[PDB]
Amino acid sequence: TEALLARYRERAEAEAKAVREKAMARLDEAVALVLKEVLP
Amino acid sequence: MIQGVIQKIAGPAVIAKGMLGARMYDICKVGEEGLVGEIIRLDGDTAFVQVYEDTSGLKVGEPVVSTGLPLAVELGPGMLNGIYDGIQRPLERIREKTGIYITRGVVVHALDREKKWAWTPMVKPGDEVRGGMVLGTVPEFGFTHKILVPPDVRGRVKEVKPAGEYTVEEPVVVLEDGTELKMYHTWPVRRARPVQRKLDPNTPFLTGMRILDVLFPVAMGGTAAIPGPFGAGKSVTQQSLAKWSNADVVVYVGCGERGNEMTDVLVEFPELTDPKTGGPLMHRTVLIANTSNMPVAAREASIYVGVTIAEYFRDQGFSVALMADSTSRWAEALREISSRLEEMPAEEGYPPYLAARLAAFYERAGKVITLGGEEGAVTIVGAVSPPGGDMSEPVTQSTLRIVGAFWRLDASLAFRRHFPAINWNGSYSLFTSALDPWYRENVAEDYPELRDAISELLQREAGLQEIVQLVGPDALQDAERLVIEVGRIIREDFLQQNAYHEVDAYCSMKKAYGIMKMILAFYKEAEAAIKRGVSIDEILQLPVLERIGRARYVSEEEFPAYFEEAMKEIQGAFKALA
Amino acid sequence: ESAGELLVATARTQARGEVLEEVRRRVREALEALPQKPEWPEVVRKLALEALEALPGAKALVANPEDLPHLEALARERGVELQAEPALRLGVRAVGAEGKTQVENSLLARLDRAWDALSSKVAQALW
Amino acid sequence: LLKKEYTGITYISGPLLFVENAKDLAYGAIVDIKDGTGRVRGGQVIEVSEEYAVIQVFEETTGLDLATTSVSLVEDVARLGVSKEMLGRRFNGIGKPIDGLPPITPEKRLPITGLPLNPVARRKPEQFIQTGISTIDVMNTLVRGQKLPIFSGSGLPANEIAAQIARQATVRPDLSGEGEKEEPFAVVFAAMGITQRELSYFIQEFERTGALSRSVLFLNKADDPTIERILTPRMALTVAEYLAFEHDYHVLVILTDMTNYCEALREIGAAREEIPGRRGYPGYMYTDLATIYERAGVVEGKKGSVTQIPILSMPDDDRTHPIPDLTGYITEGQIQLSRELHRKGIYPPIDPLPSLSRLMNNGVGKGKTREDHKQVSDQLYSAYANGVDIRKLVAIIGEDALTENDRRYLQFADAFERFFINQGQQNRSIEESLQIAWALLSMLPQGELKRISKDHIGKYYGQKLEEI
Ligand SMILES: Nc1ncnc2c1ncn2[C@@H]1O[C@H](COP(=O)(O)OP(=O)(O)OP(O)(O)=S)[C@@H](O)[C@H]1O
């Protein structure tokens, strides 16, 4: 049926947004780490 | 110690410059990793080195150091019950320091230096010693391993270690000129070890396979080639020989073949029993493994390492069977190296000296009086893998000129599960005549006549097959139908042998003689019945054929009584025809 | 009926990949405009020095004209000519002895060649 | 790390170019070739000297000039970034994704040529694989850790059989003595020299049944650069080895057409002007095919396994052609499709007489499949061979009138071909295939069925051919 597909796509986009949210805090920390590693 | 740098890298071949003074066929350590290589061409200040290990990642300018010595193996206690790579490195100790993958540049002693051995001297101070004499003995696995003087060493004994536990590195004998003699010595793999005399081979190499031991026998010091297409059963025959033959020591060389076969040997052999002494089969065995995906240049080294180890065990008075899993892979390695050398190929791309190398390898076999005065032998069975099954390819043809036995496998028999799949029409043996006195003395006085009659029956059956295909089996006389059926019986009940059956895998000479006697007695009685007006239909329906067919599954212990009851049943059946 | 697994896996993959791409954009924009920090001569000195570490002998070093004089200690020591190309922002490149070999240390190139190894740690730290 | 560039290009001809200086380039290294337009090509150092290094360009050399072309080092050893999220993805055969999803995050960067397995570290392949095909599972059974090619012709349905095996292959741990919940199983699929039509077929097949989720696909198209066909099995086996020996996966590897790979290898070798072989193929083709195939197997102390099924098209159905000849010399057996069985409408057209599984004899028995497996297989082979050798004598004699027991085998042979071999898209279990085999064993229990001595007759005989 269509309902299973709709529920799966909605939960998939929701958890994608959740992973984005829980990356958002550490984005700048990772950026600082990469900046300190690339520079000699 | 000549030291140079890498000038050029192209596959397994490295040009080293600054090597003025390096000697032909000396071992070199290539690169910072110290990869083992061998010089095969010298040109001005440079040297051409063939690397026995992978050359990936080598960089121009890395040092190349020549050891000043040719490719040599360490010969002494500790080789039995072991597996080695192409240049005699223990694969188990390589694993225990490297993991599940074989990385290059690993250095490890061929003989365990920390193991103690029970030294038992035989010489005394003041004795004159020549090459090949026995300094003393050490027990390895029930074998009495003899510590031999190196073949080039002569002198007078100054000191002898009393007794006890020593390692192979501890000098057990010291000569008056300061020459210390250890439990081991090195020998160049490309030099045949000297012997006093070559003897004529007068005893059979019992393989346990009926067709080979009966129709195409090989003598104790002989050589045999077993070429065939893929899946014909070369390796199965080699492993059957390793399991069941009467050799004191078996050396198996996996030259460029599957690793799963070497693993199969390593797993199964410790559980099997040595047919001679009764101990575990692996204590009899030395494995030299260079799988197909191992470095290609190491195949040639592995062949020489195997044959040199076999010769060393021959020098101690043992009879040694050397199995080469495929000499075609060694030939292909030679072709690749020759192509790197820009040599002009002779035939199908092989170098022109291929036949010379094969002849020098197969010439090391033979029954000899060793330098120590004992009698030893090396038997070589070398498998060949002709491309597309073409027996006209250079390796097969150059092999046939030197081998004494030719065990030709057939694809048509292998497809139809008729194993061992020996083409008895194309095969031959040149040792059959010379072994006749031994067969008469040890099996039966009339054994050669039984064998000749069986071969004649096979010849007649093969001839009548053409008439069968032309006219049809229905429209030929009952005598020829009897010949056809007796040939079928011979094939399926005597020539066929299941190497995986717990009983059929091994067959003694007397069991084969009994089966031949059964078949020939049945044939003569059925021929008399045909002359007696008996129709072949009821002859073919006789239950005695079931006894004849099941004879080969009878164990060696039961077979002497089964043979007697089968003889009586054969008599009674054609007596009952009246 | 089983397409939900494909949807969830695709969504998570797209999310993580877009997040990593955003991290790349952030780090490349922050890596831009290094000379605005007055500590830049001290790092570009080592940036030029590692070029001479790579090249046992260099004929000349090429960079933005304003970036040249800060590195001229190496010019005095090695005798390397200083060559100007303003398009070579945030980087140092050198010409070998024969002119055939050359090395480049532009910051964007270092980021591009390091990101493949760095992403393994970045993804684990980010999640 | 800093980037060094070499501008000393002195010679370009065909696929090779020479770079002067460049003694810093290690042998076998991977390089990036950049021309004046900014396009970047790939290349591999195939020969390095003091005076120059020799690079084989991955693509065509069109557009390269000695004035502006620059060569730079990428890595001394070709490596592939691998991770567990590769499952469900697709790649072009050089590692680049072609599924539209973003690139994976590399957990490890393994060299793509691998390293030889130490023979003392291996163990004997001992667990069978249920492919769902009776003529394989019963008579030529596939064992975890085996390499077992499928020999096929140009007109035979090899791709369909490959897809069916990929869909149906399963571990069957319930029958195993070590009964347990199923261990992870995965399929790595490598397509070499494949057409767009076959690619669409495979993508549709993997999508329509969800097998894609437990699969990794490497797809090299026929119009892709020829070097990517060489590199494709390296990437596939690198991924398979990573999964199996670092995450305990049971990996089944399928190589779609090794004939295309060997044609690519011949092209590359002739480009390098090597010594030729039997039919123009390089003399070292055995070594290369061995370095591909020998990577399969089972390792002592590790739960995972790698199984290979290389499908190849025998040119002109000639088994003595170099490709099938060397493949048979390397692999442990072969599955050969019959064109005559294809003409009779039988699918899958596997001919059991010339097919062989070397590792079969130690992969079946008690605790593995059923206790009667080997005896049943022996009996089926013997009976089918007897039927075939009866029908071949009928042609020469030209007489249907023959002994009564012969007609039982002719009928047995016809029923065997029409029911056991001919199974269509049915996913027969090993128990189902054994039931079909025992039903086909309608021959006399003792007067016939005498090739293999067995007392399993009292347990399984008497079936009346009834189907579902
Ligand atoms: N004497 C035999 N008894 C029983 N089975 C046999 C025998 N010889 C061969 N076979 C079978 O046939 C297969 C072929 O084995 P081998 O003869 O070892 O192959 P080969 O001659 O080494 O050729 P390859 O595959 O290129 S190494 C074996 O795995 C067995 O299944």
Ligand SMILES: [Mg+2]
């Ligand atoms: Mg073999």
